[PDB]
A paper describes a structure:
It has two catalytic sites, each comprised of the bipartite ε-subunit whose two domains embrace the nucleotide-binding eIF2γ enforcing a conformation that favors GDP dissociation and exchange with GTP. Engagement of unphosphorylated eIF2 in this catalytically productive conformation depends on binding of the NTD of the eIF2 α-subunit (eIF2α-NTD) in a pocket between the β- and δ-subunits of eIF2B, ~100 Å from the catalytic site (Kashiwagi et al., 2019; Kenner et al., 2019). When eIF2 is phosphorylated, the phosphorylated eIF2α-NTD (P-eIF2α-NTD) engages eIF2B at an alternative site, between the α- and δ-subunits of eIF2B (Adomavicius et al., 2019; Gordiyenko et al., 2019; Kashiwagi et al., 2019; Kenner et al., 2019): a catalytically nonproductive binding mode that inhibits eIF2B’s nucleotide exchange activity (Kashiwagi et al., 2019).
Although the eIF2Bα2 homodimeric unit is displaced following the accommodation of eIF2(αP), there are negligible shifts in the other parts of eIF2B, including the regulatory cleft between eIF2Bβ and eIF2Bδ (the average displacement of helix δ-α3 is 0.6 Å) and the pocket for ISRIB (the relative displacement between the βδ heterodimeric units is 0.4 Å). The β- and γ-subunits of phosphorylated eIF2, bound on one end of eIF2B, have previously been noted to block access of a second, unphosphorylated eIF2 (bound in trans to the regulatory domain on the opposite end of eIF2B) to eIF2B’s catalytic site, on its bipartite ε-subunit (Kashiwagi et al., 2019). This mechanism favors partial inhibition of the catalytic activity of eIF2B when it accommodates a single eIF2(αP) trimer (state I in Figure 7B).
Numbering used by the authors:
A (entry chain E): 1 to 11, 25 to 134, 155 to 238, 258 to 295, 342 to 444
B (entry chain H): 166 to 518
C (entry chain J): 40 to 468
D (entry chain D): 8 to 98, 119 to 351
Write the structure that this text describes.
Amino acid sequence: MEFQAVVMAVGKPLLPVGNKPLIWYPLNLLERVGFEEVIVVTTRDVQKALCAEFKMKMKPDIVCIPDDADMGTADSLRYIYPKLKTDVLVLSCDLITDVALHEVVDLFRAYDASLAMLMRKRDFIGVDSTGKRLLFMANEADLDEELVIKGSILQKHPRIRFHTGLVDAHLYCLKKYIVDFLMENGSITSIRSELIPYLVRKQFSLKSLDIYSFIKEANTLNLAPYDACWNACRGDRWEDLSRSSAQIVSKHLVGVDSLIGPETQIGEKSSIKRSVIGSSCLIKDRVTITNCLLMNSVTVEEGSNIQGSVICNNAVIEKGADIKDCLIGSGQRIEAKAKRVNEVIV
Amino acid sequence: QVPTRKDYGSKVSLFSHLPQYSRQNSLTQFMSIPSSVIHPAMVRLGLQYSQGLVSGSNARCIALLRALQQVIQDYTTPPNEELSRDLVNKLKPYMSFLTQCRPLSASMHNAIKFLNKEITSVGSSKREEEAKSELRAAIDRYVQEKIVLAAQAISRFAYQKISNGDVILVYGCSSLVSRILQEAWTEGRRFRVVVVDSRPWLEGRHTLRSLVHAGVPASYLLIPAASYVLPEVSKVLLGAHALLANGSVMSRVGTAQLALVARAHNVPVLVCCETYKFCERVQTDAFVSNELDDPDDLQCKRGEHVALANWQNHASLRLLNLVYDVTPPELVDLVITELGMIPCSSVPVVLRV
Amino acid sequence: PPPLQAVLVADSFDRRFFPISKDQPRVLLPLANVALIDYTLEFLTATGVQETFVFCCWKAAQIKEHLLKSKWCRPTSLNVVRIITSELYRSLGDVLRDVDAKALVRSDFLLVYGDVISNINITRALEEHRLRRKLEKNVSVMTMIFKESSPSHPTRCHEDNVVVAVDSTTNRVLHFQKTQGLRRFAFPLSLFQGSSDGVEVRYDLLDCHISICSPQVAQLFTDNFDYQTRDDFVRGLLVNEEILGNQIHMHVTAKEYGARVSNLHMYSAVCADVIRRWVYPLTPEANFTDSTTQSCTHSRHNIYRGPEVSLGHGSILEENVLLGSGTVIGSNCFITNSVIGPGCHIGDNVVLDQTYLWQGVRVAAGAQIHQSLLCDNAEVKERVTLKPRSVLTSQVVVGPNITLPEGSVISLHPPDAEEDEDDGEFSDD
Amino acid sequence: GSELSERIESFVETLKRGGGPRSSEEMARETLGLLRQIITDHRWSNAGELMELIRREGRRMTAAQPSETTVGNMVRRVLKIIREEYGRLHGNEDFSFHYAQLQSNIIEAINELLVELEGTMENIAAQALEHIHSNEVIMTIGFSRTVEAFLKEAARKRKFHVIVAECAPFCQGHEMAVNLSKAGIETTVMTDAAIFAVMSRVNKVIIGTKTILANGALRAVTGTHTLALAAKHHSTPLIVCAPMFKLSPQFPNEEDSFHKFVAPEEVLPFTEGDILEKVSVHCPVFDYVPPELITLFISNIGGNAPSYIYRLMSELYHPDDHVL
């Protein structure tokens, strides 16, 4: 095979937290364009059972392997190296976009590249004048307030348009020998932090090693925060319907644009402010929109309304629902709480 | 299946039989990301052709033959299907895909012809490994004895026909003529070189740099100015993408114009080319079998704003830019090959037999 | 649209033409048998400039005398060069101080040096610069005019390269720095911190010193009494962007041309680059300094020809020559790329390459000359040979049976040179 | 009045710097307006002194831009007007036989010449319909407003393909073809590297010209020599759509700097780099079409072979004014 689209996932659960299975989103984006068999990597921090929840995947064919807790993506790929016998198309589980992924692979294949990433409008990335090849990228660690640009590259690629507010989509079509180098070396614990800067820097190491980086304005990945998932599902209500669909509902209430699926019992006179009606939800009273998160095992009544308050799994809130941006984690059998949007903890 | 990319813009009437693709919308916009139906090498190759990252004739032939060695080496023989036949029946869709990306020049045509005649000359008395190694070694030897030793003999011939103080003229990019000029300068001949370039793929600058970074005194000028410099020129030395059967050398889109004005001013034209561009076919002019660059690239940034910006909106306006043009065997005086300095009308009688 | 001043500061203050400039200022050297002051004057006239307040300190008598016998002297002209001279100032800072004094300009001059060689029609830049003004009401102070080039061109010696961090949406400058012996660069993050919506590190730009300005530039040069050039001006103004920003605005012109000679090296480039018509209209045979001394006739390979040349027999001229009036050349000669001057008398069998001959020079037989300036009447005896950049100036002679080393700056003053004038190589006094 | 002096000087300055005005007919009209101004604002009473005056400005002008033959031969023609009117009134020496009557006559003749000079596009345009028989493929080159007027007049009653090469030094064929297609001519832009491949399929080659010499041979925007040489290899009939004032009486190799070399920046832009040190780049803008490839000048009097053009000299310019 040309590619071997290994997927990375390193830290209730945290990967599949959304309207539909989150890992499915990169898996679906893999399946849209060929990609029968696609390696995956799960962890041990949250559980040695991510795969044990990845058995109902509505996909034709996959492969799964777990690993330990505090293992950097470079370390994970190093571990997985044995079953990686060609080019590699790394990805990340928390990536939800409509990327014309044919494009990045077209870059890598056309220019005979060696690292085709994918970006979308701290990190300063100096891309070339043509908008594609990149020559600089660094964070605020290796530099106080300046940007040392080696003289040779400027004398060889004078125009260098910089870019700052670029959310990396963490896709990285590497090449084989890059991964071989990664396997021999060990002083590297993150491709996105210690290898990719190294490849950029040593691009002028003839048999050079080019490096390209497509840019676009389409859609992002889910970053680390529990917050970004909100706007993720916000855009996704409209994005995913391009392929709700089928559920068990009450069909009486008044509200659209939120998590509308099965595995919940709701009533009427209820709105949906892009909120999270996840698994095992239940609200039977005269509740309203909340623009917040209600995770697994939800329960609320007696005029229930919120404003961004994260209500995690095992949700039981009653006794004068006044919620506002005040996250409360699992074991949420918390009712008499005038929640404020001030500094709150789960 | 391998799809067929669309055409681009209304063509010209007399060219309703030719395809006008567009560099922008590559084919693999509608393709499988893992290289499914077409070997990874061939999809990469075609993708870089349709993107114009490989230009010369020898460049295209070598990129192709590298891709073909990549296919043969990473080949798996299907269950009880003969190699001698499954190989060629699998290569046919790749050829159609390349022809879909950028129509195969005469060099790629002769290379494919030889390769198919080569595969279809193996039998069942060979293992997969030995036959595959033989194919790879035969392609290696074909390259080293048709586009590497050939250029050696051609330069060593065209050096004896280059005397001192004679501003040799050339056209655009090429590999054989630049090798000839640099080798003959290394042997001592103190001449000039008058590079003539054209729009829109200004292929003159490639040979310009590859000359001036080797010492020869250059002099670069566009094509509508040939009739200026040809007074003092003393030889023309063109490239040849294809040597047809009548002798009418096909090559880049201006060689005909140059041969004409340089026969009018009476300065002897040459065309140097190896013995593997003898395309067996024959044609009369440059309307029956050409290519078409994406015409949208003609628009020149002269002045403050291009005059062909909204090229399509105007109904009657119809751009084009041919990619090939033909010198009949009358305007041409020399065909240099590894067989000698044969005259241009004795192409089909030595390049064949 | 008020008229367009031009504060032609016509004396390069930082001395780099030594010993050459000690005779006549650099603003009067013959580029190709024409005075650099005239090249910049014709440039300023071409872009429609009313007044050219030329300022001169050193040898200003000679400059004024040469400008009174010009095409810009007679009052029928449109470029009313109102010469102004004092001996005090010695830096463009002091010159803008003088502008604060006499309060000459009213808006939008052109802080052009004395040796600018250009045909840059600045109407586009002026127009969009005044639009930049009228939008945000005069915070956009200066507006330099750089030229898109490549960092390996001969008109970019290892000294003049500049690196400019510049905004892209509006071509506003952000950081400027020379490259006088660096291998890395340093761009404070204040550029992005202000507006990281997009910047660019342009190092294909070539400096041209055609800065549009404002009366506000006079204000900003009289406020900081420590500024000592335009380089240092912008380098000091670019840092305090939050106290009365006064933000520069870069500009590129890719089809025009413009340079500013600052040494025999860049001078060799801009001269033997004007010969090749690179700056047209301002080619030689246009004879924009319409005088009968150097009018010329084109030819193949641009081998120009002035009146009464009388070249030898069997002598060839390869390319890019510019012969001069009355300058005889013997037989079996050989010239290439040279730029002869008015009045010379070259010998026979001589060989000249990239060389220069300003006037009155008398080169003799057998003389091999390559890539070397030879200023006024620097007569030369027989059987000599020279080497690259071997500039010998000012009536100096060189005796028979004598060579010179590679870099041989010699002159009639013993101390200023690396030799002394005589009729010999060594033992000059 | 010194106003004439400043006007003439601004004029020659504009001629040296950059074309003014752009349209050739407009430059001829401006030259004639200026020359008339000389015949109303100077000191003369003879005819010989006025001929010396006119020569004293014409030498300056025709030495300013040696490729502005328009103003040069326009000065030649006003000289011929002087000769003719002075000779008819008084009458080889010119004497101050009489006075202002001569000047009134000169102003009237110049007004007539200027009126004939301003309405020439329409003349040739009305002369088109007879030439462009339907379903041609008329191959122009460059952008010559007379040829555009010719063609977009003839295509108001017929239909024909129009190939148009673009001049490769700097492309103006583009603007001609855009202006054409805004009248619906089914035109075909192309770079003039392909004048010989797409010539066999051409019926009639309609080219403008910058200046017609007195061999018939002309000096026209570059790459038109090779177009004519092809369209004579393929023996198609050329058509040099030139009004009568684009007609200088010089002779082919009786002029140095025949061409007009412009800043080689357009052929190899400065952005290039180091290799700009050892390359002599040439940007000839005007090329010398010999007279035996041309077939039929289309002047404001009608069609004329080249072998009639010499007679036009004898009927427009005096034989002792071919040196101005």
